[PDB]
Amino acid sequence: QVQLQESGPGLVKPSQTLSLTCTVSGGSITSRYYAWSWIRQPPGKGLEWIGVIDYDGDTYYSPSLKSRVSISWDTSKNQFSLKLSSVTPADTAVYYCARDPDVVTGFHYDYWGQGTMVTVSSASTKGPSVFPLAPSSKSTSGGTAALGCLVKDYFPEPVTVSWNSGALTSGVHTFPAVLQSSGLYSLSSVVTVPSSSLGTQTYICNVNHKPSNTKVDKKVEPK
Amino acid sequence: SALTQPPSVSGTPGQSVTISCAGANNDIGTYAYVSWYQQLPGTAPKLMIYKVTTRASGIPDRFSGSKSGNTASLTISGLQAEDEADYYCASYRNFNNAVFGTGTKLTVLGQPKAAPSVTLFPPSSEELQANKATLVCLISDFYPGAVTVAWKADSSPVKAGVETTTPSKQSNNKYAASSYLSLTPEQWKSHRSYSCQVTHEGSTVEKTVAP
């Protein structure tokens, strides 16, 4: 029902500002006794509270962040946004959007957003090079093969790989990206298919890298 | 500031673990808005408990909320593999502020052993045309989360151009890792083949691709 989706750039440089926007649906953002907040979790560290905006419209922020946080909202568009200034890489995190079901009863967030990755660097973007990984089963189950896509050299996280425009979901394994010595990321996606489908089925991997605007569809046919 | 929770807590693949969340008089001591969230990898936190003892809709009865002074606690009675996640405590802070803890990564351990499934890939026609070469070795479905990758040129070992990821948790609870070998079109052609040798708990899984 109440569903939250964060919008935001994936790459931002030190002097820039963070215009992160959250969209609420399945519930009014000005109703009952609801509070809306921002929470960021840097790479492998813990959750951090940024600030709240209540259904009445006044806001509160973390005292450490207070100086550069100017939360705002749009009731007509069922939105609320966060604004961060003077950004340094300490602001690199997965930024979250969350709801408080009551406010006359207390803190807790029931509903959350999937999060959006924000990375601060100087550090131009690079679109991924997509290569096809043709099948063979010398290490697989008889009848099953293994194909996939090599998403090489891209900055930064993340990239999303889907098969046949989301029509193929089963047996799909997308591997966590490797941060190379070069500073770029590289990942592979694998789908275990029955060998009988190689002379039959067309396999297309849909690679999407939102920061560099990259959207590549690669047909993975046997060699 | 922040709430102190142990960086790690490991539990018997049965029962029963307790996690501490330590605060101060003017947060955990005066207000009763202590909330616990469970975050399994890749997803957002899930409300597990609020108001010190209140279990949320759907939460099982084996999760418990407790508090002494400026220290809140979460108890898990009989853990499943579902429980393998990071745990965060929160509280109200004056005036109208929230605070999260450091986090506690719960590890369940009497878990069975799973041999790694290895898939090795030869450098694509497209990559070799682009004057580059990458060897894709994909390790998955392995428990515990510790592996060692040896790359072989024919039978001799390779150290240069090797990039291995740290093992990460899967949707099913097991581990996944990715090893990449960078070479040149001439290096891939001048050998009869390359092999990805994966070692896991005293056992070896070797996979071979040839130009």
- If asked whether residues A112 and A191 sit together in one domain, one would say no
- If asked whether residues A139 and A67 sit together in one domain, one would say no
Contacting residues for A75 by C-beta, under 8 A, at least 6 apart: A29, A30
Q: Report the CATH number of the B8-108 domain.
A: 2.60.40.10
Our count of domains for chain A comes to 2
* Amino acid in position A24: V
A55 is written with which tokens? 């259904």
Separation CA B62–CA B79 (nearest Å): 8
Q: Which domain holds residue A147?
A: 129-220
Contact A133 B176 (CB under 8 A): no
Place of tokens 């959006």: A116
Contact B97 A48 (CB under 8 A): no
Domain ranges of chain B: 8-108, 117-209
**B136: three-class secondary structure by DSSP:** strand
- Residue B181 near residue B207 (C-beta atoms within 8 A): no
- Residue B2 near residue B21 (C-beta atoms within 8 A): no
DSSP secondary structure string, A41-84? Answer: E-TTS--EEEEEEETTS-EEE-TTTGGG---EEETTTTEEEEEE
- If asked whether residues A31 and A109 sit together in one domain, one would say yes
Last residue of a domain, one of A86, A102, A120: A120
Separation CA B34–CA B27 (nearest Å): 9
User: In angstroms, what separates the C-alpha of A41 from chain B's closest C-alpha?
Assistant: 10
Beta bridge partners of B179: B137, B164
Of B32, B33, B168, the CB nearest to A176: B168
- If asked whether residues A116 and A140 sit together in one domain, one would say no
Q: Which of A48, A97, A175 to mutate to test the interface with B (most CBs of B within 10 A)?
A: A175
- If asked whether residues A106 and A170 sit together in one domain, one would say no
Contact A47 B100 (CB under 8 A): yes
Which positions in chain B touch A114 (Cβ < 8 Å)? 43-44
If we measure between CA atoms, which residue out of B2, B31, B23, B30 comes closest to residue B70? Answer: B23
Resolution of the structure, angstroms: 2.8
- If asked whether residues A144 and A194 sit together in one domain, one would say yes
- If asked whether residues A182 and A103 sit together in one domain, one would say no
DSSP secondary structure string, B87-118? Answer: EEEEEEETTTEEEEB--EEEEE--PPPBPPEE
If we measure between CA atoms, which residue out of A135, A219, A152 comes closest to residue B180? Answer: A152
CB atoms inside a 10 Å sphere around CB A71? 19
- If asked whether residues A75 and A152 sit together in one domain, one would say no
Element (H, E) at B155: none
What length is written for chain A? 223
A21 is written with which tokens? 């926007």
Contacting residues for A214 by C-beta, under 8 A, at least 6 apart: A127, A128, A154, A159, A207, A208
- If asked whether residues A105 and A136 sit together in one domain, one would say no
If we measure between CA atoms, which residue out of A52, A30, A48 comes closest to residue A39? Answer: A48
Q: Is B110 exposed, middle or buried (0-12, 13-18, 19+ CB in 10 A)?
A: exposed
Contact B96 A52 (CB under 8 A): yes
Separation CA B37–CA B44 (nearest Å): 9
Contact B165 A178 (CB under 8 A): yes
CB atoms inside a 10 Å sphere around CB B35? 27
- Residue B210 near residue B193 (C-beta atoms within 8 A): yes
Structure obtained using: X-ray
Contacting residues for A223 by C-beta, under 8 A, at least 6 apart: A134, B125
- If asked whether residues A87 and A184 sit together in one domain, one would say no
If we measure between CA atoms, which residue out of B51, B200, B136, B78 comes closest to residue A100? Answer: B51
Which positions in chain B touch A49 (Cβ < 8 Å)? 90, 97-100
- In this chain, the answer to whether the domains covering B8-108 and B117-209 adopt an identical fold is yes
B114 is written with which tokens? 């799973």
Instruction: Tell me if the domain spanning B117-209 has CATH number 2.60.40.10.
Output: yes
Separation CA A109–CA A50 (nearest Å): 14
Check residue B29 and report its DSSP letter: I
Of B51, B99, B138, the CB nearest to A49: B99
User: In angstroms, what separates the C-alpha of A32 from chain B's closest C-alpha?
Assistant: 18
Last residue of a domain, one of A96, A120, A144: A120
User: In angstroms, what separates the C-alpha of B166 from chain A's closest C-alpha?
Assistant: 9
A64 is written with which tokens? 């450490």
B88 is written with which tokens? 């965060």
Range list of H helices, chain B: 125-129, 185-189
Separation CA B163–CA B182 (nearest Å): 8
Last residue of a domain, one of A120, A152, A170: A120
- If asked whether residues A157 and A75 sit together in one domain, one would say no
- If asked whether residues A18 and A91 sit together in one domain, one would say yes
B92 is written with which tokens? 């109200």
B174 is written with which tokens? 């097991």
* Amino acid in position A32: R
